[PDB]
């Protein structure tokens, strides 16, 4: 566990989150870099690892405490409560991360809103994203057979402006003091035009 260098727990799989946009700037109050301007593509997992969101809207910072528009802002962190949200597979909270994200920004003029269902498991998997004229393309290894490492196309997003930047959204799990689980790290490899 990163927070406590002594305790050791079995490793669990966790999904990442990203923000992709066309222009970047500063968070005006704190002068912290990493603010996406105009229409921004956001990919957010939710539902205790059973759902993933995808929307393309303008992020309007909120001036409340510890939010993007305040002077006490440090980072955009999405959280969830396993005790309440992930109590059981029947009462999974599908909007916990989305509700956490809405506290940082007001969502304005969103072009679309998509979601995809993910079967809960512990197998390793791969995720990819590209873009061409048709739009933004998503790839996954859970499409055909999760026990093979090949990635297959499963979605196309209507984003046509050229994407130049992306930023990983950090996650922090508010687990109780009993569990205090450990989360698997993920790795990002850049694609290149190759034979």
């Amino acid at each position: 566990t990163i927070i406590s260098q002594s305790t050791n727990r079995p490793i669990k799989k966790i999904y990442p989150a990203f923000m992709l946009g066309h222009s970047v700037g500063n968070y005006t109050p704190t002068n912290i870099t990493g603010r996406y301007l105009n229409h921004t593509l956001v990919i957010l997992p939710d539902g205790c690892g059973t759902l993933v969101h995808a929307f393309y809207c303008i992020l309007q910072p909120r001036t409340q405490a510890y939010c993007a528009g305040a002077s006490t802002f440090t980072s955009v962190t999405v959280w969830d409560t396993p005790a309440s949200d992930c109590a059981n597979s029947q009462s999974y909270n599908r909007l916990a991360n989305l509700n956490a994200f809405k506290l940082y920004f007001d969502l304005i003029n969103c072009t679309f809103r998509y979601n995809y269902t993910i079967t809960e498991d512990e197998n390793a998997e791969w995720f990819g994203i590209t873009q061409d004229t048709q739009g933004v393309h998503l790839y996954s290894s859970r499409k055909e057979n999760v026990f093979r490492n090949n990635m297959f196309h499963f979605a196309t997003l209507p984003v046509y402006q050229k994407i130049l930047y992306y930023t990983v959204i950090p996650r922090s799990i508010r687990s109780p003091f009993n569990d205090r689980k450990a989360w698997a790290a993920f790795y990002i490899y850049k694609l290149h035009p190759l034979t």
Partner: protein
């Protein structure tokens, strides 16, 4: 030869954004992508008065009777008298800073006039296009040119709007200039259409090609023309018993050898001339036999 057509049922493609509202300027063109839907092309084309069309590696008639994997359309307001500036290889400002047509896929260029009775489309005040887009440098102006099918880098600056001829907007390193002139008479528009053909099923088909003439059971022993999910050809289907969730089987040399049909049977696919034939001929008796 008989016929054999199998097509899935899909919803209608949404062309309402193009048929309602005010078309955008050329530098801020609107793009629509259609997958897994059907369209009534006759209805769409009737709404417009076409002045010219130019297609590459495809024909307009074929676009009304064939299936594709994807359909992309870019449209914007454009005066017909500036048609030459949209032609491939033009040296004008339209190609440099507004729109460059891409030729990596089969495509068509259509110019048309909006009739008066088509009141759902609203006329803009003026036609507009950019004259230059550059970055200030020590040597001079560092012009930025549009990639094929892409947007101009000065798009954000151009969003501020132009109220007079040769009005310039700058935000520091970037500077752009625009040109406007009033719209007279009926509105005129442009349409850049591109299509892609996939080796798998093609889910974008016109309504005129939507049919289920899957009478293959009665046409087993006959050379027929088949059109199965966008795959066309000629062959003979033989009853056969037989990798993944795919309806088509191909050999190493990319020949279609097997098909899975809607009825539930599996058919072997062979060309209409497949059985070898040899003739034994005797010159003395003028007799012949077949093997």
């Amino acid at each position: 030869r008989g016929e054999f057509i199998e097509q899935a049922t899909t919803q209608e493609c949404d062309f309402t954004p193009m048929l309602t509202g005010t078309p955008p300027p050329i530098y801020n063109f609107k793009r629509l992508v259609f997958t897994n839907c059907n369209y009534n092309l006759t209805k769409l084309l009737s709404l417009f008065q076409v002045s010219e069309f130019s297609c590459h590696q495809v024909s307009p008639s074929s676009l009304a009777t064939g299936c594709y994997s994807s359909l992309t359309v870019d449209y914007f307001a454009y005066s017909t008298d500036m048609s030459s500036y949209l032609q491939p290889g033009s040296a004008g400002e339209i190609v440099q800073f507004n729109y460059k047509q891409d030729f990596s896929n089969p495509t068509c260029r259509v110019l048309a006039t909006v009739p008066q009775n088509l009141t759902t489309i609203t006329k803009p005040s003026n036609y507009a296009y950019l004259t230059e887009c550059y970055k200030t440098s020590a040597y001079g102006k560092n012009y930025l040119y549009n990639a094929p099918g892409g947007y101009t880098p000065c798009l954000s600056l151009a969003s501020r709007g132009f109220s007079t001829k040769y009005q310039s907007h700058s935000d520091g390193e970037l500077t752009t200039t625009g040109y406007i002139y009033p719209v007279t008479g009926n509105l005129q528009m442009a349409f850049i259409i591109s299509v892609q053909y996939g080796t798998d099923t093609n889910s974008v088909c016109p309504m005129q090609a939507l049919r289920n003439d899957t009478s293959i059971e009665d046409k087993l022993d006959v050379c027929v023309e088949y059109s199965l999910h966008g795959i066309t050809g000629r062959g003979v289907f033989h009853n056969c018993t037989s990798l993944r969730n795919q309806r088509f089987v191909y050999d190493t040399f990319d020949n279609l050898v097997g098909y899975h049909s809607y009825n539930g049977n599996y058919y072997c696919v062979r060309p209409c001339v497949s059985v070898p034939v040899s003739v034994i001929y005797d010159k003395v008796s003028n007799s012949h036999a077949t093997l």
